[PDB]
Every structure is written in structure tokens, then in C-alpha cells.
């Protein structure tokens, strides 16, 4: 029965999912033209970049 | 606290360049206004005297 360690694998899967989501939520646009800070600082002017 | 008062003559087509965070011929090489400028801009024609 490989599913006997339910909680021991569940906590590790939850931690891995939380870390993967926290890392993946950096490439999502929250109202800007892109998700790269360098692109915002390069293309747009300082006022709109702020 | 401090009220700085400067004066200068400018062309009519160059008045729109006097703005916080504005580029132009008389906006990047003669007078650079900061992006956090807190003040008033007073302009008036003086063709009858200059």
C-alpha cells in the first residue's frame, strides 16, 4: 500500500505547490504592460514606470 | 517652508514642455522639472514689452 503515508506526502505536496505557485505568480501581469521589471524600466518613462 | 521663485522667458510653442516629467528641447537641456514637483506654474504673454 504506497498510500499508507498519506499525510507525510500530503504536507510535502502542499509545501511544493505553495512554493511553485509563489514562484509562478511573478510572471503574471497585475496591471502593467509586462511582468519583467527591467522591461518596465526600459520601455516606459520613469513616471509611468512608477 | 521654502518658496523658490525663478523667472525666464520662453516661446509660446514651448510652454507645454514645462511640466513635471516632460521631455523636449526646453525640457531636458534648459529646465528639468522633478517628478515630485509640488508647486504652481505661472505663465503670461509679454509680447507688448519684449
From Swiss-Prot, chain A:
Q: Tell me what happens on changing residue 10 to N.
A: In strain: Delta/B.1.617.2, Mu/B.1.621
Coiled-coil region list: 9-50
Q: What does this protein do?
A: Subunit of the fusion protein that is processed upon entry into the host cell. Mediates fusion of the virion and cellular membranes by functioning as a class I viral fusion protein. Contains a viral fusion peptide that is unmasked after S2 cleavage. This cleavage can occur at the cell membrane by host TMPRSS2 or during endocytosis by host CSTL. In either case, this triggers an extensive and irreversible conformational change that leads to fusion of the viral envelope with the cellular cytoplasmic membrane, releasing viral genomic RNA into the host cell cytoplasm.
Its recorded name reads Spike protein S2'
Source organism of this protein record: Severe acute respiratory syndrome coronavirus 2 (2019-nCoV)
